[PDB]
């Protein structure tokens, strides 16, 4: 299972994940691929911000789902 993460303004990556992976697992993967620290990272799925504790299934994040990444200015 794969998901898409994007700022929509110049960053777009694809990650390999499982439904049991946590929002923290994802931000770690984002940091590994792009070097953005997870404290810098905001992830949003269908308007609702994502909290690091829940899993992808908690938010019903499926295969090929698109996640918006916001990089907070620091």
């Amino acid at each position: 299972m794969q998901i898409f993460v994007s700022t929509f303004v110049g960053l777009t990556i694809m990650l390999e994940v499982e439904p049991s992976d946590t929002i923290e697992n994802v931000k770690a993967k984002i940091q590994d691929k792009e070097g953005i620290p997870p404290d810098q990272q905001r992830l949003i799925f269908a308007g609702k911000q994502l909290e690091d504790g829940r899993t992808l299934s908690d938010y019903n994040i499926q295969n090929d789902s698109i996640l918006r990444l916001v990089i907070r200015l620091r």
Binding site: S6, F8, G10, T12, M14, D64, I66
Partner: protein, 200 residues
């Protein structure tokens, strides 16, 4: 949307991400929001061309009838090239009008657009003004394109003559990009470029 269209765009989007050409920072694709109907593309200028060192953003719209009609593609980044409009970014390339084939891909379009930069076809022109300068005074086209590559696409510094005349006229109150356009399209004739600029 037709499942054939969205499945194919998703697969071709992934393919470009994982491509070797992306790994070598030659092409890339981005989402602009949570759909696959509009994409943003990016191509690196081919080496040994005025576009070298520059990067060119591409607006990419995927029609409802994909894959049986080509994507609609336009340069967002301004560029001086005979087969691309210096004003709108419109593209004249056969695979985007009458020579599209269903087996072509996002990847394939992007590398064809890169090849177009290295191999202009001036008797299938998009920009008559650019294409005539291409044919009549090749070295000026090359230096103008390198200049556009530098100011618009992040390429390294271009000919300093052109930078001079752009300075002289920018001092007279004209907008800097209007001067670039004016000077480029009037073949760096400072007179006729100034006469055109006054009608603004």
């Amino acid at each position: 949307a037709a499942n054939i269209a969205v499945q194919r765009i998703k697969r071709e989007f992934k393919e470009v991400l994982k491509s070797e050409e992306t790994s070598k920072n030659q092409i890339k694709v981005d989402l602009v929001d949570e759909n696959f109907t509009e994409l943003r593309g990016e191509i690196a200028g081919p080496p040994d061309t005025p576009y070298e060192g520059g990067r060119y953003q591409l607006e990419i719209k995927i029609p409802e009838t994909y894959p049986f009609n080509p994507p609609k593609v336009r340069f967002i980044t301004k560029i001086w090239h005979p087969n691309i409009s210096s004003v709108t970014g419109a593209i004249c390339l056969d695979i985007l009008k009458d020579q599209w084939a269903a087996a072509m891909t996002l990847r394939t379009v992007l590398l064809s657009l890169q090849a177009l930069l290295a191999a202009a076809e001036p008797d299938d022109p998009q920009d008559a003004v650019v294409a005539n300068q291409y044919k009549q005074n090749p070295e000026m086209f090359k230096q103008t394109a390198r200049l556009w590559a530098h100011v618009y696409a992040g390429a390294p510094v271009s000919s300093p003559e052109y930078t001079k005349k752009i300075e002289n006229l920018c001092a007279m109150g004209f907008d800097r990009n209007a001067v670039i356009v004016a000077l480029s399209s009037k073949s760096w004739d400072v007179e006729t470029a100034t006469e055109l600029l006054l009608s603004n």
